């Protein structure tokens, strides 16, 4: 009947994992592999621990809300949740921490002088005749326009233009590979 129970040495708690740590005195000659009254001791020395743990868990701060069903996040008004503290035991990671700091020689050139990054606002430009907003790259990009022009006004010049673009693309990829090898 009592919802409480006393133990000499105080149990340590990890509410961030829902874990208890008891360090009281056991009896070597109670849990031996053949003692008849073995379960009736295990199940109780653990039940008092669970009692202390539920006592500790049912006294944390609760977090209510006023939302309703459909709420894209989670809980609704009819759910109280316990705000668990953080764990304390140093349990090891599984992969090291992520760090990869290469300057790729562009972050060195641009930083020796004062080239700041760009604002990254939008992807559209304004075509003048025609009167549309014609993505700079992303649909019939302004680049791929000398390709389907109906006359170029000087070997086919449009194919030479394609080749000259491809050369810079491949040079950029090679520069990237070199930087990553450095």
């Amino acid at each position: 009947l009592p919802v409480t129970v006393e133990k000499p040495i105080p149990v340590v708690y990890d509410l961030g994992n829902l874990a208890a740590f008891d360090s009281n005195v056991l009896d070597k000659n109670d849990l031996d592999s053949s003692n008849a009254r073995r379960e009736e001791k295990i199940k109780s020395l653990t039940r008092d621990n669970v009692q202390l743990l539920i006592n500790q868990l049912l006294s944390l701060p609760m977090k209510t809300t006023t939302e309703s069903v459909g709420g894209t996040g989670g809980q609704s008004s009819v759910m109280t949740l316990l705000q668990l503290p953080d764990p304390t035991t140093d349990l090891p990671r599984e992969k090291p921490l992520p760090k990869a700091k290469a300057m790729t020689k562009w972050e060195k050139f641009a930083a020796k002088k004062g080239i700041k990054p760009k604002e990254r606002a939008g992807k559209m430009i304004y075509d003048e005749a025609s009167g549309e907003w014609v993505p700079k790259w992303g649909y019939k990009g302004a680049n791929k326009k000398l390709d389907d022009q109906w006359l170029v006004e000087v070997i086919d010049p449009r194919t030479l233009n394609r080749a000259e673009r491809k050369r810079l693309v491949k040079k950029n990829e090679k520069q990237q590979r070199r930087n990553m090898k450095n």
Partner: peptide
């Protein structure tokens, strides 16, 4: 406050 929220806490009897 985080370092406070880990102690044992106040169960009535």
């Amino acid at each position: 406050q985080k370092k406070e929220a880990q102690l044992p806490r106040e169960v009535a009897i």
